[PDB]
Amino acid sequence: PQNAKLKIKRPVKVQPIARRVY
Fold first, then answer.
1. Which residues 6+ apart lie within 8 Å of 19 measured at CB?
2. Which of 1, 2, 6 is nearest to 15 (CA)?
3. Could you tell me where this protein is found in the cell?
4. What are residue 5's phi and psi, to 5 degrees?
5. Over the Cα atoms of the chain, what is R_g?
6. d(CA 13, CA 22)
Protein backbone atom coordinates (compact mmCIF):
# COMPACT_ATOMS: atom_id res chain seq x y z
CA PRO A 1 0.00 0.00 0.00
CA GLN A 2 1.41 3.62 0.78
CA ASN A 3 5.01 2.82 2.15
CA ALA A 4 5.77 -0.19 4.55
CA LYS A 5 2.51 -2.34 5.15
CA LEU A 6 -0.59 0.09 5.24
CA LYS A 7 -0.38 4.02 5.38
CA ILE A 8 3.25 5.21 6.37
CA LYS A 9 4.90 2.39 8.64
CA ARG A 10 2.51 -0.51 9.80
CA PRO A 11 -1.06 1.13 10.57
CA VAL A 12 -1.33 5.04 10.26
CA LYS A 13 2.05 7.01 10.77
CA VAL A 14 5.14 5.31 12.53
CA GLN A 15 4.14 1.70 13.80
CA PRO A 16 0.32 1.58 14.77
CA ILE A 17 -1.52 5.01 14.88
CA ALA A 18 1.13 7.85 15.57
CA ARG A 19 4.23 6.07 17.26
CA ARG A 20 3.38 2.27 17.80
CA VAL A 21 0.73 1.88 20.74
CA TYR A 22 -1.70 4.91 19.92
1. 13
2. 6
3. Cytoplasm
4. 85, -95
5. 7
6. 10
